[PDB]
Design an enzyme around this catalytic site. Structure first.
Site, PDB file in Angstrom:
ATOM      1  N   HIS A  17      -1.735 -14.946   1.128  1.00  0.00           N
ATOM      2  CA  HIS A  17      -1.935 -13.698   1.560  1.00  0.00           C
ATOM      3  C   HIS A  17      -2.706 -13.179  -0.171  1.00  0.00           C
ATOM      4  O   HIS A  17      -3.480 -12.087  -0.140  1.00  0.00           O
ATOM      5  CB  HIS A  17      -1.128 -12.773   2.083  1.00  0.00           C
ATOM      6  CG  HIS A  17      -2.048 -11.566   2.305  1.00  0.00           C
ATOM      7  ND1 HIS A  17      -3.050 -11.320   3.444  1.00  0.00           N
ATOM      8  CD2 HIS A  17      -1.983 -10.224   2.294  1.00  0.00           C
ATOM      9  CE1 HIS A  17      -2.951 -10.235   3.882  1.00  0.00           C
ATOM     10  NE2 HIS A  17      -2.242  -9.206   2.864  1.00  0.00           N
ATOM     11  N   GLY A  55       4.123  -3.910  -2.881  1.00  0.00           N
ATOM     12  CA  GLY A  55       4.664  -4.727  -4.136  1.00  0.00           C
ATOM     13  C   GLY A  55       5.835  -5.948  -4.217  1.00  0.00           C
ATOM     14  O   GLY A  55       6.446  -6.933  -4.897  1.00  0.00           O
ATOM     15  N   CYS A  64       6.085  -8.013  -1.369  1.00  0.00           N
ATOM     16  CA  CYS A  64       5.246  -9.166  -0.874  1.00  0.00           C
ATOM     17  C   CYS A  64       5.634 -10.431  -1.859  1.00  0.00           C
ATOM     18  O   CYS A  64       5.807 -10.333  -2.930  1.00  0.00           O
ATOM     19  CB  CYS A  64       3.712  -9.269  -0.941  1.00  0.00           C
ATOM     20  SG  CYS A  64       2.943 -10.409   0.426  1.00  0.00           S
TER      21      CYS A  64
HETATM   22  C1  LIG Z   1       5.429  -1.324   1.643  1.00  0.00           C
HETATM   23  N1  LIG Z   1       6.151  -2.584   2.113  1.00  0.00           N
HETATM   24  C2  LIG Z   1       7.420  -3.258   2.387  1.00  0.00           C
HETATM   25  N2  LIG Z   1       6.962  -4.459   2.371  1.00  0.00           N
HETATM   26  C3  LIG Z   1       5.338  -4.535   2.253  1.00  0.00           C
HETATM   27  C4  LIG Z   1       5.192  -5.362   1.738  1.00  0.00           C
HETATM   28  N3  LIG Z   1       3.478  -5.938   0.994  1.00  0.00           N
HETATM   29  C5  LIG Z   1       2.639  -5.770   0.592  1.00  0.00           C
HETATM   30  O1  LIG Z   1       3.879  -6.046  -0.900  1.00  0.00           O
HETATM   31  N4  LIG Z   1       2.237  -6.458  -0.583  1.00  0.00           N
HETATM   32  C6  LIG Z   1       0.632  -6.373   0.838  1.00  0.00           C
HETATM   33  N5  LIG Z   1      -0.647  -6.011   0.633  1.00  0.00           N
HETATM   34  C7  LIG Z   1      -0.580  -6.389  -0.578  1.00  0.00           C
HETATM   35  C8  LIG Z   1      -1.279  -5.211  -0.967  1.00  0.00           C
HETATM   36  C9  LIG Z   1      -2.039  -5.718  -2.533  1.00  0.00           C
HETATM   37  C10 LIG Z   1      -2.627  -4.775  -3.431  1.00  0.00           C
HETATM   38  N6  LIG Z   1      -2.886  -5.403  -4.323  1.00  0.00           N
HETATM   39  C11 LIG Z   1      -3.428  -5.273  -5.262  1.00  0.00           C
HETATM   40  N7  LIG Z   1      -2.432  -6.694  -4.050  1.00  0.00           N
HETATM   41  C12 LIG Z   1      -1.730  -6.709  -3.269  1.00  0.00           C
HETATM   42  C13 LIG Z   1      -1.015  -7.669  -2.613  1.00  0.00           C
HETATM   43  C14 LIG Z   1      -0.652  -7.763  -0.889  1.00  0.00           C
HETATM   44 CL1  LIG Z   1       0.630  -8.827  -0.344  1.00  0.00          CL
HETATM   45  N8  LIG Z   1       1.371  -5.590   2.183  1.00  0.00           N
HETATM   46  C15 LIG Z   1       0.527  -5.993   3.591  1.00  0.00           C
HETATM   47  C16 LIG Z   1       0.097  -7.572   3.952  1.00  0.00           C
HETATM   48  C17 LIG Z   1       0.654  -8.647   3.294  1.00  0.00           C
HETATM   49  C18 LIG Z   1       0.391  -9.819   4.346  1.00  0.00           C
HETATM   50  F1  LIG Z   1       1.250 -10.708   3.464  1.00  0.00           F
HETATM   51  C19 LIG Z   1       0.307  -9.794   5.189  1.00  0.00           C
HETATM   52  F2  LIG Z   1      -0.222 -11.244   5.986  1.00  0.00           F
HETATM   53  C20 LIG Z   1      -0.522  -8.964   5.595  1.00  0.00           C
HETATM   54  C21 LIG Z   1      -0.498  -7.247   4.855  1.00  0.00           C
HETATM   55  F3  LIG Z   1      -0.824  -6.455   6.066  1.00  0.00           F
HETATM   56  C22 LIG Z   1       2.287  -6.106   2.458  1.00  0.00           C
HETATM   57  O2  LIG Z   1       3.103  -5.799   3.561  1.00  0.00           O
HETATM   58  N9  LIG Z   1       4.891  -3.476   1.746  1.00  0.00           N
END
Ligand SMILES: Cn1cnc(Cn2c(=O)nc(Nc3cc4cn(C)nc4cc3Cl)n(Cc3cc(F)c(F)cc3F)c2=O)n1
Ligand SMILES: Cn1cnc(Cn2c(=O)nc(Nc3cc4cn(C)nc4cc3Cl)n(Cc3cc(F)c(F)cc3F)c2=O)n1
Lengths: 301, 301
Positions: free
Chosen positions: A41, A143, A145
């Site tokens: 991702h 953050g 992931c």
């Molecule tokens: C609340 N929560 C609980 N667990 C998580 C995990 N998570 C995450 O940390 N980040 C996500 N999306 C990103 C956004 C970004 C913005 N920037 C600047 N960089 C980013 C990197 C990421 Cl990975 N997501 C959402 C998400 C991550 C995925 F790997 C996926 F396949 C689908 C998704 F909808 C996330 O859930 N957040």
């Protein structure tokens, strides 16, 4: 008393966490020997996130589009590939803190420790189970992931989970370290529901043995049950089947307490049929299903 | 989603654990720079454990009587002294894994992570709170003496607990890293009872703030109270009185939610006097008292 969720010491894993950035998208990676593993991702812009074609997105990237940081030290990427939902970035330096390790795929009901991390920095450690519906009921923030789940046996770290996402219900979804999701999920930012969850019966029984070991016995009775009849009731209450292998695995706890496995099943049956009548077991108003038989023996010896 | 006990990553502490043996008596120690800290109980033979004369036991010991091991590697002892209930063994090697650290003495209600260790080998990590009666409801087996409790702020490890003993009720007692017991206990193998425990009010209030942050706010009422009035009522329900410091540590949660501390106190007072009327808060009919205001902010934000 004092029986509680206990995680493995996290040091061996902490020494492997790094940060991976592509453009402004950033997350956690796992640095083992000369390879960093992370969710693919990371290659998505906020627009791509919504509906990615990963093979197309990846062919448009070269090594220099990946920034890997181990603390403040940048690691140079010298190769990349994708295995299912996991990106593998070959770097020009081996991690000297790499533990003995294996990658394993766990089964529903099995437990693991999670090292929650933010921007490559470890933040906390706690125990989780793989749910029958292949979600995990984690504690993860934005953050996180790329945070991993693991068990430790001797000096060997068995990595079993790489965190990807939070579902709308607040439970979590992720992959094994070969990049295959647990459950019917996809690595896309779109609303996804899980299947209806069930309770992990063998674990509930383990926890009732833990309660007896700790002096909590109010729920015991003299009723008896066959395995079949217990399972009929279990199924009716959305509990997983109890197998003969499960009975066998509960043998040591049965021996330690002198309560036959099927007698404990009879106790559980009455709890399902009657409820707890406002009482608690090991301080809980709910029947706990995230301790395995191994977890109990480990903590109680 | 939700709240759970979460430990700090344990790596920084794992790298400091050693085994200390005097004769056949063996326990865990903490190796920071060129000193190993451990419970002075290690100098007791079985016959000394009930009523030890520590000054007499120590005068009869030389550096050469202490076996300090990092795994199977012996660290040569070059000095020894006793400070309260802790022994300090100067060794000839500064631990290269020593983190930035402080020794701190905590108050009841404060939480910390415990790294449970056996024979100098870390086994598990979990979060605990110090009870008002100065015990901890830990999870420890034989061989855990000398395991430590800590918090990590930035990259600094604040050590706050060194485990000594299990009391008859199965709760645990120990010292700070200066060797001063929390509570009215002594380092002798005699039955020692804890005082009657109470509920940690400041933490219950933190839990209510956590519930409000998450949109569960049925218990907020139209009333307020003075701190004095509240404290007098609290005591009638075996709740701890609040201190000025408690009010202050609730400040960030109060600001985040816009619910004044004393208004929250009035809400809690109504819950104490009336009960919950069959309702739950964060899914539970029981009020949680082992999450601090800091723990809530850490898990929410
Ligand atoms: C609340 N929560 C609980 N667990 C998580 C995990 N998570 C995450 O940390 N980040 C996500 N999306 C990103 C956004 C970004 C913005 N920037 C600047 N960089 C980013 C990197 C990421 Cl990975 N997501 C959402 C998400 C991550 C995925 F790997 C996926 F396949 C689908 C998704 F909808 C996330 O859930 N957040
Ligand atoms: C069940 N449990 C939970 N926590 C504990 C901690 N604990 C412990 O680990 N050991 C203890 N006594 C020792 C016996 C030894 C036998 N050998 C060969 N070596 C030994 C070393 C120790 Cl420390 N104790 C008892 C205890 C330890 C103290 F430090 C003390 F001051 C009074 C005590 F009664 C113990 O509680 N066990």
């Amino acid at each position: 008393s004092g029986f509680r969720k206990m995680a493995f010491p996290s040091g061996k894993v902490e020494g492997c966490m790094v940060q991976v950035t592509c453009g402004t998208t950033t997350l956690n990676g796992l640095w083992l020997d000369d390879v960093v593993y992370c969710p693919r991702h990371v290659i998505c812009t906020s627009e791509d996130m919504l509906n990615p074609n990963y093979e197309d997105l990846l062919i448009r990237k070269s090594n220099h589009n990946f920034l890997v940081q181990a603390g403040n030290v940048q690691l140079r990427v010298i190769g990349h590939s994708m295995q299912n939902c996991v990106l593998k970035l070959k770097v020009d330096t081996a991690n000297p803190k790499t533990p003995k390790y294996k990658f394993v795929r766990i089964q529903p009901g099995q437990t693991f420790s999670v090292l929650a991390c933010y921007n490559g920095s470890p933040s906390g450690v706690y125990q989780c189970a793989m749910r029958p519906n292949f979600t995990i009921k984690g504690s993860f923030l934005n953050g996180s992931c790329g945070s991993v789940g693991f068990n430790i046996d001797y000096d060997c770290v068995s990595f079993c989970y790489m965190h990807h996402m939070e579902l709308p219900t607040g439970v979590h979804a992720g992959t094994d370290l070969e990049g295959n999701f647990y459950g019917p999920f996809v690595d896309r930012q779109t609303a996804q529901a899980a299947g209806t969850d069930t309770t992990i019966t063998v674990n509930v029984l383990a926890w009732l043995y833990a309660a007896v070991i700790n002096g909590d016995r109010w729920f015991l009775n003299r009723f008896t049950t066959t395995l079949n009849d217990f399972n009929l009731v279990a199924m009716k209450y959305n509990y997983e089947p109890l197998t003969q292998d499960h009975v066998d695995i509960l043998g040591p706890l049965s021996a330690q307490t002198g309560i036959a496995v099927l007698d404990m099943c009879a106790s559980l049956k009455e709890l399902l049929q009657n409820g707890m009548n406002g009482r608690t077991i090991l301080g809980s108003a709910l029947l706990e299903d995230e301790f395995t038989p191994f977890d109990v023996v480990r903590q109680c010896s």
